[PDB]
Amino acid sequence: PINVAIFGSTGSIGTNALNIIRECNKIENVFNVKALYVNKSVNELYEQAREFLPEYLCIHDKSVYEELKELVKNIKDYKPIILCGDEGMKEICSSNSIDKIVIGIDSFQGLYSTMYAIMNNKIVALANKESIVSAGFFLKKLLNIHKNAKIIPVDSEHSAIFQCLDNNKVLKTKCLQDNFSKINNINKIFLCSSGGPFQNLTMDELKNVTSENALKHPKWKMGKKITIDSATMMNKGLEVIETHFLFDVDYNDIEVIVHKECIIHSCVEFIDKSVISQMYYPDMQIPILYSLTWPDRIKTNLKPLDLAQVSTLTFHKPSLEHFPCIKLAYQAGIKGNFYPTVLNASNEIANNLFLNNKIKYFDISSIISQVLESFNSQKVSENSEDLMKQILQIHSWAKDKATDIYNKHN
Amino acid sequence: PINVAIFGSTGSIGTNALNIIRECNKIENVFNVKALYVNKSVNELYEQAREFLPEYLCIHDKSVYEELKELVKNIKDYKPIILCGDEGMKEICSSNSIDKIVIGIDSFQGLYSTMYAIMNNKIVALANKESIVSAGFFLKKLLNIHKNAKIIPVDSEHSAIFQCLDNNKVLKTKCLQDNFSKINNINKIFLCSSGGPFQNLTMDELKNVTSENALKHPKWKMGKKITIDSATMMNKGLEVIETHFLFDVDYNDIEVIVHKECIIHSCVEFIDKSVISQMYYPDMQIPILYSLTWPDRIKTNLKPLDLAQVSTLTFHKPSLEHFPCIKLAYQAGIKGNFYPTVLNASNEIANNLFLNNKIKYFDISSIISQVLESFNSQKVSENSEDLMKQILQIHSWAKDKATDIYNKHN
Numbered sequence: 001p002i003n004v005a006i007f008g009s010t011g012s013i014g015t016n017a018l019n020i021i022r023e024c025n026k027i028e029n030v031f032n033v034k035a036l037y038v039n040k041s042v043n044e045l046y047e048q049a050r051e052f053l054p055e056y057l058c059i060h061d062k063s064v065y066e067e068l069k070e071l072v073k074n075i076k077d078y079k080p081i082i083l084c085g086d087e088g089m090k091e092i093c094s095s096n097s098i099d100k101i102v103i104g105i106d107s108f109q110g111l112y113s114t115m116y117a118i119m120n121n122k123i124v125a126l127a128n129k130e131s132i133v134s135a136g137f138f139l140k141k142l143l144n145i146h147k148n149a150k151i152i153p154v155d156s157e158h159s160a161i162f163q164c165l166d167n168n169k170v171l172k173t174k175c176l177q178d179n180f181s182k183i184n185n186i187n188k189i190f191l192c193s194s195g196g197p198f199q200n201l202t203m204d205e206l207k208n209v210t211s212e213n214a215l216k217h218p219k220w221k222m223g224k225k226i227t228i229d230s231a232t233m234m235n236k237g238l239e240v241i242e243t244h245f246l247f248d249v250d251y252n253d254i255e256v257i258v259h260k261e262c263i264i265h266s267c268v269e270f271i272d273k274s275v276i277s278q279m280y281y282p283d284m285q286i287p288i289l290y291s292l293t294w295p296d297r298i299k300t301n302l303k304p305l306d307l308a309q310v311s312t313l314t315f316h317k318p319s320l321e322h323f324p325c326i327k328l329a330y331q332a333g334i335k336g337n338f339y340p341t342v343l344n345a346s347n348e349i350a351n352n353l354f355l356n357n358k359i360k361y362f363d364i365s366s367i368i369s370q371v372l373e374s375f376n377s378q379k380v381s382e383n384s385e386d387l388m389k390q391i392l393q394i395h396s397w398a399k400d401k402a403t404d405i406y407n408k409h410n
Numbered sequence: 411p412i413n414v415a416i417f418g419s420t421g422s423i424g425t426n427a428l429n430i431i432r433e434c435n436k437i438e439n440v441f442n443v444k445a446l447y448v449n450k451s452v453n454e455l456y457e458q459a460r461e462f463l464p465e466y467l468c469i470h471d472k473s474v475y476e477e478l479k480e481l482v483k484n485i486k487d488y489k490p491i492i493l494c495g496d497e498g499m500k501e502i503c504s505s506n507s508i509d510k511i512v513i514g515i516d517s518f519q520g521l522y523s524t525m526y527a528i529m530n531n532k533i534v535a536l537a538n539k540e541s542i543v544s545a546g547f548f549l550k551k552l553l554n555i556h557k558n559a560k561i562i563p564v565d566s567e568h569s570a571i572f573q574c575l576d577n578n579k580v581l582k583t584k585c586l587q588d589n590f591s592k593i594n595n596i597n598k599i600f601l602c603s604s605g606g607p608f609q610n611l612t613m614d615e616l617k618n619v620t621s622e623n624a625l626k627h628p629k630w631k632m633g634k635k636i637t638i639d640s641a642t643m644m645n646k647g648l649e650v651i652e653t654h655f656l657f658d659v660d661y662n663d664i665e666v667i668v669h670k671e672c673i674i675h676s677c678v679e680f681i682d683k684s685v686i687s688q689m690y691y692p693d694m695q696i697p698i699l700y701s702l703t704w705p706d707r708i709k710t711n712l713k714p715l716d717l718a719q720v721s722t723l724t725f726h727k728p729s730l731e732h733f734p735c736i737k738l739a740y741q742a743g744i745k746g747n748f749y750p751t752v753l754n755a756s757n758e759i760a761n762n763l764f765l766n767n768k769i770k771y772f773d774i775s776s777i778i779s780q781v782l783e784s785f786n787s788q789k790v791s792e793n794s795e796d797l798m799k800q801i802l803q804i805h806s807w808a809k810d811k812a813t814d815i816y817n818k819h820n
């Protein structure tokens with residue numbers, strides 16, 4: 001039986017995780033949900049607790065901590081360990097009754113639990129790309145210290161890549177290890193993208209698009225932050241860096257392709273030029289499930305892919321003029337050092353400004369661009385604790401700098 | 411050092427096999443071409459011998475044996491063992507200096523060298539699907555006795571499927587072995603097809619198609635036999651049966667899909683509903699190369715796949731009214747026993763009759779159908795030698811029956 005904790009259980013990823021676990025458990029009882037962890041959504045967490053009855057409940061915000069304890073009392077025959085904040089999360093991570101942890105917490109914040117899960121030698125089913133982008137080489141260093149810990153990618157393109165590999169090669173290495181692409185004979189990555197809601201707009205239309213435009217399309221079913229990143233294609237930019245760190249693929253060997261039907265989720269070209277790709281309907285349940293079953297697969301009752309019904313699949317290059325965030329992400333990745341950290345942080349700010357109607361579409365890239373050119377590279381700390389502080393301080397520096405730039409032009 | 415013999419070196423498969431070996435050897439000196447074997451193309455074999463300088467040369471037609479020896483003595487500093495007929499084939503198969511054999515011999519004839527290669531515990535890179543279709547159960551029996559032998563598929567769709575699989579599971583089993591699909595978590599197979607030159611014809615148009623139309627469908631030249639089979643989609647019917655035997659997949663789990671761009675070469679749906687596919691330009695060099703390098707990959711200088719330029723991929727279900735050969739294959743496969751043997755034999759006759767303008771398009775299926783209807787199940791004999799002679803009897807019977815049916819009408 002697979003003992004699982006869901007971190008960020010009330011969001012888009014967490015809900016999909018619980019969905020697939022539920023439906024798979026109807027076929028055979030494969031998963032035990034041992035812990036749920038949310039930020040503020042106490043009512044929704046209670047409802048999930050009622051159904052799945054985990055041994056652990058944690059809410060990050062102390063201000064709703066009491067409210068959770070009282071709500072949970074209605075559930076008969078159930079006495080969970082109810083915890084909160086950083087302290088609660090660390091206790092769950094160190095529990096010997098948990099094997100696998102799904103990280104569906106958003107933003108740079110997802111790094112903290114990812115770090116402690118690793119330090120506790122757990123399998124980390126990581127959907128949070130911000131932690132990889134911002135702390136790539138820290139996570140690397142951490143995985144060399146904690147040799148039984150593993151990151152399994154949940155991000156759909158990276159899951160697709162991972163699913164295309166031979167596991168007799170994968171098991172010789174692990175995600176975020178130097179030389180991963182060489183051991184797996186990977187030559188090149190086709191990184192597929194929906195292209196987002198603005199894919200058909202002219203430069204003139206792009207000037208005046210609003211966050212509401214970005215958020216209204218039902219085709220995009222995710223959290224608000226990632227929805228905005230999909231619209232600017234900064235999401236794909238982040239995923240380029242994520243691909244580089246997870247799989248040790250050279251930036252010049254990662255190609256972004258717009259595939260509007262979202263059936264082919266990404267492709268791996270091996271050294272012989274043979275290309276392998278993973279496909280399904282655009283549904284996060286597959287990537288989530290695979291992270292929890294790897295290196296095996298289990299039966300599901302998901303809708304089978306009907307290729308003749310889909311009938312047509314299309315592919316084109318993205319326009320860098322229309323989506324300058326892509327270009328900025330390659331530039332930050334190629335530059336290396338802490339430039340990806342700076343990229344992620346300034347995007348956090350720019351993303352949120354646009355979401356709340358404070359800046360325009362092209363201001364997003366303008367702000368990010370100015371922060372990256374403000375940054376002064378630092379010698380990378382050889383010490384693991386000092387490296388973590390370095391990342392925190394640089395992330396924080398970049399967010400402040402982005403705010404300065406916004407203010408300067410406001 | 412990969413010590414390889416090429417059987418049927420002067421045909422389409424053989425030539426392509428020598429092409430990729432040549433090109434790959436320029437990068438890394440991997441392959442030793444140890445043997446070349448052809449029917450009667452002595453001059454072409456001579457030119458190949460001068461380039462590749464194999465330790466063995468063999469020609470099936472003894473009437474050109476002296477012509478071979480006389481041409482070969484023109485090759486400066488080179489003294490091969492030049493061999494003859496079935497005997498020469500058996501000697502090459504028993505050579506310890508040979509590890510892998512590519513079977514690029516066409517038709518039921520290919521089964522003989524396939525059998526002897528397996529009896530000598532070789533790795534058999536098998537392009538010849540007719541041997542599998544007509545003698546699948548016998549090959550399975552043979553592989554159970556000769557435990558170090560393996561069949562690695564070369565047929566592009568089956569190579570595709572093989573590549574889509576996770577080698578960590580493939581390595582725990584082998585092609586034709588019981589439980590292959592269970593071990594590999596296979597739920598179903600999308601068997602892709604070019605659809606052939608007649609894919610867009612109406613029923614009335616199809617009535618009138620001739621062999622010259624079928625053979626003009628070019629790009630890369632194949633044997634006349636498979637070219638006609640592609641036109642009737644009997645090729646795909648044979649491939650459905652080949653899929654069943656190679657991978658132990660149920661007939662109701664095999665779906666034929668017409669993909670006219672021939673970029674996706676086939677797809678595997680796993681029990682979780684995730685789908686994996688192999689893609690490249692249509693080109694037999696990759697499937698050939700992979701059968702010789704498996705479970706590894708090596709570098710090539712083949713043109714990289716450019717998905718943006720390809721731009722569109724399309725899929726549709728084939729019409730069984732327009733292509734009744736497909737239906738006949740499912741029917742023969744499902745009935746089991748020696749019906750696949752009978753299908754293959756009667757097709758060999760019908761195919762050749764159509765090739766030579768003796769019968770019409772729909773007479774092909776009519777003749778095959780009548781032989782299948784005529785045949786009565788036989789008790790399957792238990793020892794290998796007995797089962798082989800049983801196969802040979804039934805094969806000869808079915809060919810004679812097809813010819814008699816033809817003789818009765820025209």
Ligand SMILES: NC(=O)C1=CN([C@@H]2O[C@H](COP(=O)(O)OP(=O)(O)OC[C@H]3O[C@@H](n4cnc5c(N)ncnc54)[C@H](OP(=O)(O)O)[C@@H]3O)[C@@H](O)[C@H]2O)C=CC1
Nearest residue numbers: 008010011012013038039040041060105106127128222223
């Ligand atoms: N949504 C998707 O399909 C995909 C998401 N991702 C990645 O997954 C991550 C999550 O995205 P998504 O699910 O869309 O985001 P959501 O906004 O939908 O969900 C965020 C979840 O994290 C929780 N959370 C936030 N902060 C904390 C904290 N400090 N402690 C505990 N829980 C916290 C939230 O809790 P609360 O409900 O209380 O606010 C919520 O449950 C992102 O990093 C994203 O990049 C990647 C690919 C696809």
Ligand SMILES: NC(=O)C1=CN([C@@H]2O[C@H](COP(=O)(O)OP(=O)(O)OC[C@H]3O[C@@H](n4cnc5c(N)ncnc54)[C@H](OP(=O)(O)O)[C@@H]3O)[C@@H](O)[C@H]2O)C=CC1
Nearest residue numbers: 418420421422423448449450451470514515537538632633
């Ligand atoms: N062509 C292709 O791309 C594909 C082919 N296949 C399969 O591969 C096999 C070969 O097809 P293809 O290459 O098109 O066929 P070809 O007709 O082009 O080649 C047949 C080859 O086999 C040789 N041959 C015939 N009889 C004998 C024999 N008695 N002993 C030794 N050699 C013999 C021929 O020699 P000679 O030149 O002297 O006549 C020739 O080299 C077929 O079973 C086909 O179904 C499967 C998928 C794709």
Ligand SMILES: COc1ccc([C@H](CCC(=O)N(C)O)P(=O)(O)O)cc1
Nearest residue numbers: 155156193194196230235236262282
């Ligand atoms: C509707 O299908 C899809 C919509 C959007 C996406 C991408 C954003 C969400 C994501 O990263 N996933 C699912 O991994 P993007 O390609 O627009 O960046 C992928 C699929």
Ligand SMILES: COc1ccc([C@H](CCC(=O)N(C)O)P(=O)(O)O)cc1
Nearest residue numbers: 565566603604605606640645672692
């Ligand atoms: C142009 O690419 C292609 C042409 C033809 C085919 C098939 C026939 C030859 C074959 O079996 N191969 C290459 O494996 P079919 O689908 O028409 O039966 C596949 C690909």
Ligand SMILES: [Ca+2]
Nearest residue numbers: 573574575576
């Ligand atoms: Ca594989």
Ligand SMILES: [Ca+2]
Nearest residue numbers: 783784785786
């Ligand atoms: Ca009868």
Ligand SMILES: [Mg+2]
Nearest residue numbers: 155156157239
């Ligand atoms: Mg993604």
Ligand SMILES: [Mg+2]
Nearest residue numbers: 565566567649
């Ligand atoms: Mg084929």
